[PDB]
Design a protein around this ligand. Structure first.
Ligand SMILES: O=c1ccn([C@@H]2O[C@H](COP(=O)(O)OP(=O)(O)O)[C@@H](O)[C@H]2O)c(=O)[nH]1
Lengths: 505, 505, 505, 505
């Protein structure tokens, strides 16, 4: 007999596991337990802090919720109005010396006229082809070209997406982008060119809210804290090392065994196959593709430069920098970096030279957070990536050679993006149903490997819905129908449902 | 305080209300109660019997389930292998002296050659127009022409649908018809013409099971029997006369008041509006449209004629009979009509004449069930419709003039079909949310008026999901996304969920 | 027996008739003569002079020759280099205060940005519809929209063409416009909008030669002068009053009868019908439509204004002036108006006021020639049209209010344009073969009534080809195939053919 | 100075040369003469006779005139109604044991059903593609597929045209086929399949007339005979061996020199170039491509078999016979073969056996004329081609193994078809203008090398129009605009024109 027995064991306390846990706690029916190898819940939605006091998320993390239930849990966890800051969704594409507002194609008037001609011509071709199309695109590349035409494709989405995914766009499927027909809005694009006009897709009603304190990680610490502590096991004492699917027994690193009736595994499915010592599943999961994510963080002295301004996140298609995305993380909260009166020595100048003095000087400070992808098709030199990022900051005019860097951060995350390759679905549909037959709900960004439902709210709800499937026979909508959940307001499920109301009576 | 108080009240014990009751009974959380003005549950899925022992459903009722939950409750209600008879769909369309296999449009290959030309020419125009189409059809008619061409439109689709919906095809929308109306492949249809082949396997009901006893009504009586009797109130004692939405109080005919927290109403929503004395809702519901259904039953002496054979239901686009559909009801179960040893006198010959003898004679007997639609746009002479149907049977060679009729049946059902008019949705999106704000779940064939989810299983699940929404924050999928639930096997929700399994240990 | 007998009789000594006579005179086989009711040959290709010495053509006449034969005869008629002046086409469209380079539809780049958007959007619409179009436009208007979109239609093509054709675009066919109306390339038009470029090279008249003396009329006087005088009868003595198609006899106003074997008639065919006293033909010819042309000439004191420059002819779609076209006739030849030392009093100022004195002041002088159309759908007030035109010149900033007008000219030409109405071809194919079967070749601008072969070179060659058909069995290519003659260089026929070369040996 | 001087010299007395001469003789202005290496005029439109008395044209020659002038000359040559026989244009395609009426696609109901499916499916694809087509086909093969679809193309036009042109369909251009858009008549093809109907494109309207005597060759002997004898030089005495273009002299076999002012050459342009000792033109003309034609004639004993019947010419796509076309030449005139009373011995039976007697026996007789193509891409074994053709007649069931063959015929014509290769036009637009610059009108089937104007009427008119161009400045319509002359009634030019009517009075 196992050391512990529960009805539903949840492996992992990132967003997905915490989702499963929150729903179990609410339902308060079957017995349950959540574990994690980390003392701090949050997984890829965690936050680090440099010794100099600069916070960094695991790359740019911006919440766009598709679910009321998700909002309920964030509100419960961080209920105060000053637990959060609201910002407009401001983003730009760096192209040929210019900060081009997103979406890129509505703003090509910033480019030289010759290129505008090239762009419009390509989109005219794409429009005339769309008018007679009778097939769906089969690759990410085809989808891009049908949406944008060759000129606009070549300038942004093609080179940018290689830098993001670390695989060519021709090797990825496009179904994950949704059911929208791949066709250009030629009139919109041509109008802005003729008018010599720019327009970003943000404004007063296009916002996000970001945690006042502790970065994105502050959310999941708060959410996790609403759980009954005795049902949680976080840290080395909670690391799963073996999974016996036949006995429905899990073994922890310290030797503790847990019996379960249903298992919700939110660890990377390739690691689950290993933990299971399931040779067949190992072979299958190894056919999945992913990229690793390098997060580089740079702490800068001085008030926010005019050239940066209210920019939130930024895209880099060009090859004069290794990062695909930059975030002005200091714009997300005042508390993502030290206060102005905090004294810190200058480590280096942005051109790499030494400071004139090693004295600690006061702020104020601002902060840039960078992402660089890696795969077998796109290697990254760990010894030089920081320096190359900083040079990239100079090249893209985010920093001047004279800017004073006071803090640096670099961490590599092995499983960063699950890749929507052409082969993904053919693989997943062999893996996930075999786990299912063993009463294992493998769910999450790397639990079920689907990027289009791979954000915080999706992950959280994957865990919620998996529990709802286990207990109430609910349809796992987020898992099997990303277009469905992404295209509606999901308002039905709440942190307080009829079931808990009628019961209190 | 009212006479009785329940958390959830269900009005109506047709399939929809019984679905609500079954889910409420399974969950066993909130207190509940189901009422019906009729002593016998079943509603439009009930069965009458003539004094001579011939059973008739409310027209042809063939079960094609989209849900494992529905299957679970039917199996529970009628568990024995001999509770059911299994049949293949044998369906034909009467067209110019011939029986054309359903679907008509995929069986062109059986008509006169000169008519095959008209049909194939039409489909060729349609195919070429469809090749450059960039707009969706807006009316049922436009749909029909775009996917079939004029030839087939004029020959079958248009006259038949007027005949069954009792409004012209130009007055109906077309978002409802995914699993109802087969759109023909030009190549497939042409290929069958060339080869002289047929193709009768389109759609959901290629095999169905029919209750051995008591007609379709036997199911819902049996399902109702699994409910705790003290939580049911069927008959004059359970007739709802007043609804006070504001006090959340329902008043029954005998003056019994019932207080509720949540209301699931499965009566026709226009009658609900009347019962609420809500003159705003009355005006809105009167913008809906419906047809009435006349059901005519004819009991015939003799062994099943060769010309009839294993035919199940039959379509009649032409003008030589008033009915749009005939069901060989005696093919569905041997217990739908008297055994051969039953002695019955001949009431009339099929040509209308009086029988040679008034002596009771033995069988065997077979049985035809006919449907005739009526609306403000398609009036019916009530007084002559029985005779007109019988003559229609002679006209279409279903009966010989000398066939001996031993039993007749005619009953008018005022609300038969909720019509997918062009105005339907605009009206419903006013009505259903307004009731929703008053904590009223109006659901069902006429409860929510959507024919594309108007079958027994849909209705049942509308009830199940309304409860699942009220208690568990479930999405009402069947209600809001007909194409979604009709396009998948809905396996997740079971008559025994994890909730009950875990609780019982 | 009649007074005179010839093999071929030519009626009319405009370009078409002179064409006939030239070819007859070249061939020098069959006997022939040419008559005209006018003493001066030339027809609508003649030139008037005001008493103050200002020449005016019958509206803007610019030669654009498709035929070597025509070139041969003009060179023979006017062999000296200084018999001619060469000019580039400098043509513009007046639109919202600006001069837009011809053709309008290819110079969108010149309009305000907001008009530019409207125009391009319309062209984008048309481009997309044209990609799947499988029918030809039936009317001029349909053609316009289909090839240019609504924006350009409304802004220029529709008002301009009503103003010149004196019927709406919806009343005209569109098979005539190959070499008259440029079809805009979406890419080219958009590219020039983006770059801010112009495109003024479209068409056949990018370079023209104009006679140094006597206006366009100087050409036909000279051409007629190369004919043998005794074969001509120009003046009252050559006015045709009766045509007896049966006896093949023509009666002149002075009573002269001329018998013919073949008749080439170049007078308006409706005039021919009346002179034939052929009532059926009169009927048919009244089914044709034509507009009248008002020519207004304005002689102005001053050296050529800078705002005028090298402009040749100008289009006016707007309703701030009565005329559809202005020609800077003084730019065509220095001898179209008096020399600078010619003394002339000011008749009026352009603002309409009388001048201070009757003092004759010297030049130099420049000259504007205006055209205003009239039809039963577009009346012209003849008593005011001159003043309206002059006010028009002020409204369009052609003349300053203070400009000094020293000569004025107004003349109405009843048959100005043969309208390409919808009915035109149906009517002509009843008229011309009937005249053909009576050995009458009816040809020319109003002889055969086809504007697309309605220019001086066309007209001339219609006469030439008629003679060639009569004598040498040649195909009447210009008559029956406008697109064929207009799309090629017609170099084969010469004023000296092999026939004459060999005969002189 | 030369032995003879003329204004216009014509080399060749095939149809093209005779056309030139007929028009020269009609105009009767410039001096002229016509020469030919052959004593008998006619060229490839001549006729041979075997020693047994069977006539053979140079392959199937069927007149379809596009010109009145041609008809005038034929009718002048053979004016009696019994100089000609009239027949319906009856042709079939041999395909899988069947004689399929032409055109093939309207008669595929004779094929197996499974193949009808494949054909119709292919043509449906073609129809759908044609609806969105925005390009012209570039090759003959592309044109075939767009016209017929894949399945129909593979059965007839693709393998048949390889057998005709002796080059792949992918190596030929398709402009020569005319201006008709390459698109299926899907309804016409489908309608005949549905009706099970066959219908060839002949009837009372669709006829040809064939010479009663002397075969096609008789026409040209008769036309030549209307020429004044002393202006002709036919035989060894008229064989051109040298052309000196710079000196405008031709030298004949017997050493006679002829001076000309204009030269109409109708010999093959590659021999013209050789004769000109113009190495540049030699090199250019060698880049043209042509196939050689083998003609095989088989005289058969017996009355016409029922299986042959009224057939005229037959196409053979399949590879069980070497010939691409067969003609039932005995059906064209009863004088193409001996009378019934003529006695001939059997040479062999169709299976190759010896007859059971060498005695002469009487007729009647019938006759088959076959065509086999040869090129460098498709060799022909001259020594076995007769026997292979005869074996082909048995394989195609045209002859039974027992049929008695009483005459055989085989002749190879080196220049047989001028090939419309992709390269033809690029080559010809270099050859013809250089010859033109030297006053050489190279015209005819191999004179100007264009098959689409390569028939007897076309050829004749190339000579006629050449002369007309030389003398009267006419446009050479047939040379330059094949679509134009093939698409209209060319009725203007007559054998008696006004010129001769007027001069004779
Ligand atoms: O051969 C046929 C018979 C019926 N229908 C369509 O199918 C729909 C549903 O008819 P059915 O008998 O399936 O359903 P019911 O009326 O019983 O609910 C009708 O409205 C018809 O338009 C069709 O397209 N082809």
């Amino acid at each position: 007999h196992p050391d512990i027995s529960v009805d539903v064991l949840v492996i992992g306390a990132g967003p997905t596991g915490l989702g499963a846990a929150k729903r179990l706690n609410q339902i308060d029916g079957p017995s349950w337990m959540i574990v994690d190898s980390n003392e701090t819940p949050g997984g890829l939605a965690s936050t680090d802090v440099t010794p100099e006091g600069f916070l960094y998320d695991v790359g740019g993390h911006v919440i766009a919720s598709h679910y009321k239930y998700f909002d309920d849990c964030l509100d419960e966890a961080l209920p105060k109005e000053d637990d959060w800051y609201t910002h407009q969704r401001i983003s730009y594409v760096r192209c040929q010396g210019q900060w081009v507002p997103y979406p890129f194609q509505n703003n090509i008037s910033m480019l030289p006229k010759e290129e505008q001609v090239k762009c419009i011509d390509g989109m005219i071709d794409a429009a005339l082809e769309a008018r007679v199309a009778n097939t769906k695109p089969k690759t990410f590349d085809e989808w891009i070209v049908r949406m944008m035409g060759t000129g606009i494709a070549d300038l942004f989405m093609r080179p940018y997406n290689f830098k993001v995914w670390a695989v060519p766009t021709t090797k990825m499927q496009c179904a994950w982008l949704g059911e929208r027909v791949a066709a250009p809005n030629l009139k919109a694009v041509t109008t802005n060119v003729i008018l010599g006009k720019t327009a970003g897709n943000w404004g007063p009603n296009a916002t996000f809210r970001f945690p006042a304190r502790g970065g994105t990680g502050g959310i999941w610490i708060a959410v996790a804290n609403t759980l009954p502590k005795e049902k949680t096991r976080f840290g080395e004492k909670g690391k799963v090392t073996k999974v016996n699917a036949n006995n429905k027994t899990v073994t922890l690193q310290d030797g503790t065994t847990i019996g379960y009736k249903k298992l919700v595994s939110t660890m990377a499915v390739d690691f689950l196959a290993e933990a299971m010592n399931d040779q067949e599943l190992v072979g299958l999961t190894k056919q999945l593709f992913y990229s690793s994510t390098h997060v580089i963080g740079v702490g800068v002295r001085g008030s926010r430069p005019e050239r940066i301004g209210d920019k939130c996140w930024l895209y880099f298609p060009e090859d004069n920098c290794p990062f695909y995305r930059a975030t002005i993380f200091s714009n997300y909260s005042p508390y993502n970096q030290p206060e102005a009166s905090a004294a810190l020595p200058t480590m280096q100048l942005a051109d790499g030279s030494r400071p004139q003095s090693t004295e600690a000087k006061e702020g104020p400070y601002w902060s840039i957070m960078l992402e660089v992808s890696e795969s077998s098709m796109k290697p990254v030199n760990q010894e030089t990536i920081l320096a190359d990022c900083i040079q990239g900051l100079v090249n893209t005019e985010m920093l001047k050679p004279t800017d004073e860097i006071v803090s640096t951060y670099h961490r590599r995350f092995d499983h960063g993006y699950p890749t929507p390759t052409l082969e993904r679905e053919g693989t997943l549909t062999q893996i996930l149903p075999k786990l299912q037959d063993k009463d294992i709900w493998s769910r999450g960004r790397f639990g079920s490997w689907r990027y289009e439902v791979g954000n915080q709210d999706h992950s959280f709800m994957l865990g919620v819905e998996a529990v709802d499937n286990i207990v109430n026979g609910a349809v796992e909508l987020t898992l099997n129908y990303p277009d469905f959940v992404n295209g509606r307001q999901n308002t039905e499920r709440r942190l307080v449902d009829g079931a808990q109301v009628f019961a209190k009576s």
